[PDB]
Amino acid sequence: QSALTQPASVSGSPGQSITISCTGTSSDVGGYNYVSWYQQHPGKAPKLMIYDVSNRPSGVSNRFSGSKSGNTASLTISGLQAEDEADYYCSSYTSSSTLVVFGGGTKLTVLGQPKAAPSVTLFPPSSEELQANKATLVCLISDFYPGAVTVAWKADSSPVKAGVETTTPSKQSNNKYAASSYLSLTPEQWKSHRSYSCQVTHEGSTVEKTVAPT
Amino acid sequence: QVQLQESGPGLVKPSETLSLTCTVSGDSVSSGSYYWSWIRQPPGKGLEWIGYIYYSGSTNYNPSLKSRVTISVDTSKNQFSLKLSSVTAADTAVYYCARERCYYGSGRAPRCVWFDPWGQGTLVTVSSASTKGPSVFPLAPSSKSTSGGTAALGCLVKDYFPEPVTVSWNSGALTSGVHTFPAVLQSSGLYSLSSVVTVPSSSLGTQTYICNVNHKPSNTKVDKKVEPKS
Amino acid sequence: FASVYAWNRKRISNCVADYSVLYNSASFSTFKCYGVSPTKLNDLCFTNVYADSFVIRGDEVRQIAPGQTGKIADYNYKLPDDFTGCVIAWNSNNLDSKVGGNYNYLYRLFRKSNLKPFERDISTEIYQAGSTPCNGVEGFNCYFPLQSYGFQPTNGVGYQPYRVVVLSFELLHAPATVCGPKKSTNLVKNKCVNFNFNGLTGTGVLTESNKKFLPFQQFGRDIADTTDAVRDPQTLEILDITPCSFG
Amino acid sequence: YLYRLFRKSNLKPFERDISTEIYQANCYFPLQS
Ligand SMILES: *[C@@H]1O[C@H](CO)[C@@H](O[C@@H]2O[C@H](CO)[C@@H](O)[C@H](O)[C@H]2NC(C)=O)[C@H](O)[C@H]1NC(C)=O
Ligand SMILES: *[C@@H]1O[C@H](CO)[C@@H](O)[C@H](O)[C@H]1NC(C)=O
């Protein structure tokens, strides 16, 4: 059995109120007085803020509160902030065998922000790598809050589509995104073409940077 | 306050018996009052529960993972450890250790809830791609990276399998502008990443900027200095 | 048996106690005597014997002794430091442990202060570890004070249930009480053979009598006050105790 | 300083008994640290 965290994803506007439900099976999960909630930042251990069914431990924000109704458990917030984008899980003490059950996770998003500009930075293969009989171009993208970036790579005049790897966008602390791409080259091809470039397109807009061998 | 830390990693192969070990600090194990537990989480997926030990030696396990996992206590170094045998490819997960509160039952096992302080979580993977050490290059600060008051320099650490790898700047000194980007998985099967930091353009070579590369599954530790291009 | 946190207390009283059937029964895994070595029990008399009974783990039988520490001796059952009795213990895995776990055997694991010797505490108040008051509800630093051995038949020794009985001989200031039993031997009439008739110690030849006591009189005396007849307790016949032969 | 023996002899005066055969029948030993 598994107390389906009601909905998977969740949208929210910064400031007002979000309520997350958590339904499950019968009184072995709902009709008890033992439920808890956990907040896990992306890349960190989770952290409780609600226990028993509605108790705040020693030092948390007062926006966090929950309640119980029948076979569903509720968790609500009373004013949103930009630092509250995380996942959220439910706990519960059954009687079956799995002792304790866990939620499936809800994604809280803070819809509302100004289109940022993807800061781009490009690096050519360093000297030791040239001596190492290889070459790699490094294209870094950062701070571009709406995450639909894409990238294209350029030799002196033409596009290239071989030897490039592209990270999926990853969320930073400031809740905008970052990405990276790598270009594989033999140093003889590095000096073959007079210059390369990395271009990134984002909401129609485009910014490109360029580097030439020495 | 209390703290928890896990140890005993390594690119474990298939059909082995891996062993993690959680150590505690700030509270004795054999004190009663708390039940030490283990929770795994496969990546991009939800949590699931594994087991617990009390200070007496009473154990419990998940019935889906039953007959496969034993967890035990050392009261001499204040630590507890699991061993999961006959490992398949599905156990590539992040493994936390935490303690539980575990309210008193009534002549029928004790019920537990909420938990408390979660370990640190050490990603443990299971494949047959062996392991490899990282190759490091310094990406020099350049005028193509320079703009006005600041210029960026960094370190490229590439071609390693054993996912958890770390690069610091100046033994952990610089926290301004230091950003390590998510590692990328190539077609070759090995990871790669690059960590970059911006620093005033008046300070291109002036101060120390040495990236400290540490690879924990292996034992690689190398410091590389980044200087402007020749 | 009885729990470990509410042990029983039987007050054995005026009787004939035979600690030999205990001492040699070979069924006991632990038989320690402290005030008095075991073989001399069937030769002494006290005022009261108390017997306390309970059930513990296998490896907590070493805390039932004068001057120990641990979850059991601290606050479940404390023995004074000049104990006098004996401690008996035997394994009982087949009786008390049941598949799925026997959760009816509890023990106390939190108390404000260690027990006085032979003190007993069956309260069930929510213990308060931290400074925050508890108000009768559970939570962090507010713990229920009783835990339960979950005994199961596939437990290694030292986790299987042991039953324990603690005999404590006490001697207040009364006139007497329970003592061991006294043996006896055949009576050989007609032969200066030492004798003891339930207390009467003497020497001489014993002979069949023809006097008739009253049916509550044990022995007869002469003028100048010397024992000269007895009655055999078992068969109740009068025998003349003529002094031995001399000259 | 391993003193404190226990025996059968009861030791009529000025004699001393040295030997080790166990009073184990859980277990006992005629010596104590
Ligand atoms: C003490 O016990 C003995 C037996 O242990 C009793 O002896 C019995 O005496 C009656 C006489 O009334 C005989 O008929 C029985 O055969 C005897 N039994 C044995 C085994 O010899 C004796 O009577 C008891 N003492 C008293 C005072 O009754
Ligand atoms: C002589 O032998 C007896 C044996 O009964 C022993 O007890 C005694 O100690 C011996 N004499 C001395 C002086 O030790």
Side-chain angles (χ1 to χ4, degrees):
Chain A
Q1 68 273 18
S2 199
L4 291 42
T5 76
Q6 261 306 41
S9 167
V10 175
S11 157
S13 68
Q16 326 162 347
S17 198
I18 311 298
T19 304
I20 305 181
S21 157
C22 195
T23 186
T25 176
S26 87
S27 170
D28 47 358
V29 306
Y32 270 139
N33 295 318
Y34 309 117
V35 288
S36 291
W37 291 81
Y38 306 92
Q39 163 175 100
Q40 170 182 254
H41 278 306
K44 258 178 185 169
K47 156 188 186 64
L48 81 160
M49 76 302 291
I50 283 300
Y51 72 124
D52 163 20
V53 52
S54 276
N55 312 62
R56 290 193 307 126
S58 88
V60 290
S61 157
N62 286 34
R63 278 92 172 92
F64 295 92
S65 52
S67 157
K68 192 162 76 92
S69 313
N71 287 11
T72 81
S74 200
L75 165 76
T76 194
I77 215 75
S78 49
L80 269 196
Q81 286 166 353
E83 60 263 42
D84 306 344
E85 284 85 301
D87 303 307
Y88 290 101
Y89 297 91
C90 318
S91 78
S92 53
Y93 169 54
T94 85
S95 355
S96 157
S97 3
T98 9
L99 257 273
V100 309
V101 174
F102 260 111
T106 57
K107 185 68 218 77
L108 185 58
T109 46
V110 175
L111 245 194
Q113 265 290 264
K115 275 55 174 329
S119 146
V120 181
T121 300
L122 193 162
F123 276 73
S126 285
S127 49
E128 289 91 346
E129 183 185 15
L130 310 193
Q131 308 140 8
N133 316 0
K134 267 320 289 194
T136 326
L137 263 297
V138 177
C139 185
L140 310 84
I141 306 164
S142 171
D143 325 304
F144 51 101
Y145 157 79
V149 52
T150 162
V151 173
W153 282 85
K154 157 261 152 181
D156 304 322
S157 34
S158 33
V160 202
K161 309 75 161 152
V164 280
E165 308 71 19
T166 50
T167 322
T168 43
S170 144
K171 195 211 59 181
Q172 319 167 178
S173 101
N174 49 12
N175 288 245
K176 61 210 327 207
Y177 293 139
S180 147
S181 313
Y182 288 79
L183 163 57
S184 81
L185 321 93
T186 163
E188 63 85 60
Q189 251 173 316
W190 164 239
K191 211 42 180 209
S192 144
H193 277 64
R194 196 35 200 111
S195 174
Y196 300 100
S197 87
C198 177
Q199 74 88 73
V200 318
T201 99
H202 176 19
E203 313 326 285
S205 184
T206 299
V207 298
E208 171 261 21
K209 263 242 198 168
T210 300
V211 168
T214 38
Chain B
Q1 75 272 14
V2 294
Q3 279 169 57
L4 297 153
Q5 261 178 352
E6 302 95 339
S7 312
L11 188 269
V12 188
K13 293 308 192 204
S15 316
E16 263 189 291
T17 299
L18 84 160
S19 88
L20 267 294
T21 293
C22 179
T23 176
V24 76
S25 47
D27 182 24
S28 66
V29 177
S30 306
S31 65
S33 87
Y34 280 103
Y35 284 59
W36 318 97
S37 160
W38 283 102
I39 294 95
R40 84 191 200 177
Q41 173 191 32
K45 277 160 187 177
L47 285 83
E48 67 183 2
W49 182 82
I50 293 184
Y52 67 81
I53 317 293
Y54 199 28
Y55 86 109
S56 79
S58 176
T59 84
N60 273 261
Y61 306 99
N62 206 49
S64 53
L65 298 195
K66 246 180 178 183
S67 56
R68 218 202 297 184
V69 53
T70 83
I71 313 167
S72 297
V73 190
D74 174 88
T75 314
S76 79
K77 315 163 191 165
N78 275 34
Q79 65 186 2
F80 63 100
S81 162
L82 74 89
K83 285 176 299 307
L84 179 60
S85 90
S86 165
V87 183
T88 183
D91 306 342
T92 79
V94 182
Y95 285 70
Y96 304 93
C97 67
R99 49 192 214 116
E100 310 202 9
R101 168 67 188 85
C102 281
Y103 290 124
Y104 166 56
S106 273
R108 67 113 147 148
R111 24 236 182 65
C112 340
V113 297
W114 55 298
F115 286 139
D116 213 310
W118 294 65
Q120 216 35 113
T122 79
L123 167 62
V124 168
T125 183
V126 178
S127 63
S128 351
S130 86
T131 165
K132 208 252 150 277
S135 147
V136 190
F137 300 125
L139 312 92
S142 208
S143 158
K144 47 207 157 192
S145 325
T146 312
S147 147
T150 325
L153 35 58
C155 279
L156 182 169
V157 37
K158 68 181 315 302
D159 282 340
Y160 59 88
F161 167 82
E163 297 63 25
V165 174
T166 296
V167 168
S168 166
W169 274 112
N170 300 337
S171 326
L174 200 34
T175 327
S176 80
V178 172
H179 188 197
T180 192
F181 284 72
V184 65
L185 198 276
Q186 314 165 171
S187 42
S188 99
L190 295 134
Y191 289 95
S192 324
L193 81 92
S194 228
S195 163
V196 74
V197 52
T198 81
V199 52
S201 38
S202 83
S203 53
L204 306 191
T206 63
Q207 219 258 349
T208 167
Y209 315 112
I210 45 107
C211 58
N212 333 70
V213 177
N214 56 320
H215 193 183
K216 284 317 109 207
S218 33
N219 320 306
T220 323
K221 175 36 84 169
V222 173
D223 294 48
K224 207 53 177 182
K225 177 84 209 316
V226 192
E227 312 112 350
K229 294 166 177 55
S230 319
Chain C
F1 256 60
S3 309
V4 71
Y5 88 95
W7 30 280
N8 267 318
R9 172 87 129 173
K10 165 146 195 75
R11 41 167 306 102
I12 309 287
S13 78
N14 40 66
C15 76
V16 43
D18 54 353
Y19 315 94
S20 189
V21 68
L22 272 44
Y23 193 26
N24 56 30
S25 158
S27 165
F28 298 138
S29 146
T30 278
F31 195 97
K32 301 207 185 323
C33 279
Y34 290 107
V36 41
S37 146
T39 52
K40 283 68 46 185
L41 300 166
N42 254 339
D43 328 60
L44 222 159
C45 201
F46 310 86
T47 318
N48 257 333
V49 182
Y50 291 125
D52 315 342
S53 324
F54 45 92
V55 163
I56 45 183
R57 239 163 69 185
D59 73 275
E60 316 203 280
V61 201
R62 57 182 149 129
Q63 314 182 21
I64 309 296
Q68 299 290 307
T69 47
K71 269 170 224 262
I72 296 288
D74 273 358
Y75 24 76
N76 287 92
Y77 183 77
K78 177 96 195 153
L79 282 189
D81 221 309
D82 60 308
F83 191 49
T84 329
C86 311
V87 168
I88 313 158
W90 68 100
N91 180 318
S92 101
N93 183 32
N94 48 255
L95 285 160
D96 280 301
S97 156
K98 104 195 175 203
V99 174
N102 177 11
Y103 291 87
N104 287 132
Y105 278 122
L106 306 114
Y107 65 110
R108 166 182 314 281
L109 86 171
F110 286 137
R111 197 170 185 267
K112 298 309 296 169
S113 33
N114 311 4
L115 295 190
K116 275 82 181 164
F118 287 144
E119 182 194 348
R120 184 178 160 173
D121 186 0
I122 58 191
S123 33
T124 307
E125 305 298 330
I126 287 206
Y127 176 82
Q128 165 152 341
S131 57
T132 321
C134 286
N135 317 129
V137 317
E138 267 81 350
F140 332 129
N141 325 310
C142 287
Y143 305 139
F144 195 55
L146 298 194
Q147 191 65 269
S148 55
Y149 301 114
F151 286 127
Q152 288 211 168
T154 162
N155 282 352
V157 196
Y159 298 120
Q160 305 174 2
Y162 274 54
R163 289 179 172 197
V164 190
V165 163
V166 170
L167 294 154
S168 143
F169 319 109
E170 91 162 19
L171 277 268
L172 201 103
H173 193 286
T177 300
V178 291
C179 350
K182 325 287 248 276
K183 274 311 117 213
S184 274
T185 12
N186 297 1
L187 79 105
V188 270
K189 325 166 198 30
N190 303 80
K191 70 219 313 186
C192 172
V193 52
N194 270 144
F195 61 84
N196 178 289
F197 280 86
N198 64 256
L200 256 154
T201 295
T203 307
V205 175
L206 294 171
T207 250
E208 257 98 353
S209 181
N210 67 156
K211 287 184 290 208
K212 310 113 206 171
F213 287 8
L214 292 180
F216 64 94
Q217 287 164 332
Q218 313 286 74
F219 54 108
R221 274 204 179 105
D222 262 353
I223 320 88
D225 274 6
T226 88
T227 320
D228 64 318
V230 274
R231 183 191 247 137
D232 193 50
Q234 313 215 4
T235 169
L236 305 171
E237 252 70 81
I238 312 306
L239 313 141
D240 289 290
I241 297 194
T242 52
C244 289
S245 207
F246 78 94
Chain D
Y1 275 168
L2 168 81
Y3 75 139
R4 283 178 32 77
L5 166 141
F6 324 83
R7 275 264 169 63
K8 279 128 30 165
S9 38
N10 258 43
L11 208 54
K12 69 279 172 206
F14 265 157
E15 313 239 63
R16 74 173 208 241
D17 252 26
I18 198 144
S19 161
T20 300
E21 310 106 349
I22 43 109
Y23 252 123
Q24 169 182 39
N26 190 193
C27 158
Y28 308 114
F29 29 82
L31 269 168
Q32 269 299 71
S33 102

